[PDB]
Amino acid sequence: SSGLVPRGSHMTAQTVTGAVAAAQLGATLPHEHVIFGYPGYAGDVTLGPFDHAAALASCTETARALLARGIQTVVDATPNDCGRNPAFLREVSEATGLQILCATGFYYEGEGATTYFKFRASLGDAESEIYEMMRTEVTEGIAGTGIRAGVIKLASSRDAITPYEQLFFRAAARVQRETGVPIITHTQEGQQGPQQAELLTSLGADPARIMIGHMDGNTDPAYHRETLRHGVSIAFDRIGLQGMVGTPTDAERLSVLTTLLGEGYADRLLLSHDSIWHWLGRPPAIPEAALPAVKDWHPLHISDDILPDLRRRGITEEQVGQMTVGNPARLFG
Ligand SMILES: [Br-]
Ligand SMILES: [Br-]
Ligand SMILES: [Br-]
Ligand SMILES: [Br-]
Ligand SMILES: [Co+2]
Ligand SMILES: [Co+2]
């Protein structure tokens, strides 16, 4: 246990099929979405119903393809208000053997279903209600199913971590101190990474259990270095999603990544795609102009294209193993 180890609290990762030892996690994708729906998708149920058999077939096919790559674990980062379905994730996991951790949390103000908790906040202690929800889902289970969330998902807006969002950050810090559960986050358009790390650590959350995400959204490495100073991990977790409404290209992501790797930050860098295996609501109508922005946007892209490109650029087998196996084992295990 060299380096920065988690402050003895959580002893094993909690997956949708039960507890799993850190050493059993293996190569892991720290931020993906088996299924996902933007708030409102359920309102379009008549014309956009969930085809369970089709979704299970497509998702198990993806899980099998990941296992072929030696990826044994996926962290599903889907917020409670964005189509999270623990029971479905368990079906996919039981069917294939792929380990899946699910999340507890609400999305950022710009895209989440915010009305409910904004209302609860106007009436009383919304932070405490959110804390109770997170704590119960992490320690006891979700929706009475016994399936527990293995990570807390937090998300902030671009210009600030809004009052609405801070309710979740404060509740999550409290649950993190009590259980030691991992925290993963969404940052909007390459902003607030430092602010998130400062806020969570100042609230007492363990930096060794924190992964600030969507950091590939910023192409100035000083921003990543400022975030990393807090002792937290950062994830380039939308690899393959290029030029989509402002995101950098993978070439730009790799430049920052290789610069950080050359500066010895391998112990704090994680890689994922933020892929969606099966969309909820009506199947997305992909515009002909956006086809290139999503061509590498699937979960086999890091295994097949990114890792070999890092290796040929001088990144070592040990560094790749640290990012894809070592880091996840410590952060989620
Ligand atoms: Br469920
Ligand atoms: Br279902
Ligand atoms: Br609020
Ligand atoms: Br490799
Ligand atoms: Co996100
Ligand atoms: Co995501």
Short-list 268, 243, 240, 274, CA closest to 254: 240
33 annotated to bind ligand: yes
Resolution in A: 1.9
Amino acid in the structure at residue 112: G
Residue 52: both structure tokens together: 């369970």
Total Cβ atoms within 10 A of residue 177: 15
Q: How far apart are CA 166 and CA 96, in angstroms?
A: 37
Ligand index nearest the alpha carbon of residue 121: 3
Å from CA of 106 to ligand 3 middle? 13
* CATH value at residue 249: 3.20.20.140
Collapsing DSSP to helix, strand or coil, 272 comes out as coil
Protein residues with C-beta less than 5 angstroms from the ion ligand 3: 118, 121, 163-164
Q: How far apart are CA 303 and CA 267, in angstroms?
A: 19
Alpha helices, DSSP H only, in 12-83?
52-68
230 annotated to bind ligand: no
State the residue range of the domain holding 232. Answer: 1-333
What does the CA dihedral 272, 298, 92, 85 come to, rounded to 10 degrees? 70
> Cα dist. 264→69, 229, 325 in Å?
26, 13, 17
Q: Pairing between strand 103-104 and 151-155?
A: parallel
Q: Tokens 């006891």: give the residue.
A: 140
Number of domains in the chain: 1
301 annotated to bind ligand: no
Protein residues with C-beta less than 5 angstroms from the ion ligand 5: 186
Experimental technique: X-ray
Residue 76: both structure tokens together: 């599903």
Q: How far apart are CA 192 and CA 252, in angstroms?
A: 19
Q: How far apart are CA 154 and CA 303, in angstroms?
A: 26
Longest dimension (CA), the chain: 57
Residues in contact with 233: Cβ distance below 8 Å, sequence separation at least 6, in sequence order: 210, 211, 212, 268, 269, 270, 327, 331
295 annotated to bind ligand: no
Short-list 37, 27, 32, 97, CA closest to 63: 97
Ligand index nearest the alpha carbon of residue 59: 2
